[PDB]
Subunit: 45 residues, 2 copies
């Protein structure tokens, strides 16, 4: 699209990137654990 | 094409967001499957 230079631009991307990271890192972790306990070793004991 | 200024910010975020989504969606899926086969419950799959 457009590859220009600007202290703002760089900062902008850094902001969005970080945000997307945290959000995902949250939904992910929760998921891993979600299925973790869900398995409950075959059936409930 | 178009070499003007307008609604750039909005477009910028939309670009970064989407990118972060795809990348993560890749590392995630691969992970889920990674441990999936790793378990090799009983016999190797």
């Amino acid at each position: 699209m457009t590859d220009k230079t600007g202290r703002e631009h760089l900062s902008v991307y850094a902001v969005v990137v970080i945000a997307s990271v945290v959000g995902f890192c949250l939904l992910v972790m929760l998921f891993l654990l979600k299925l973790a306990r869900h398995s409950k070793f075959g059936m409930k004991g």
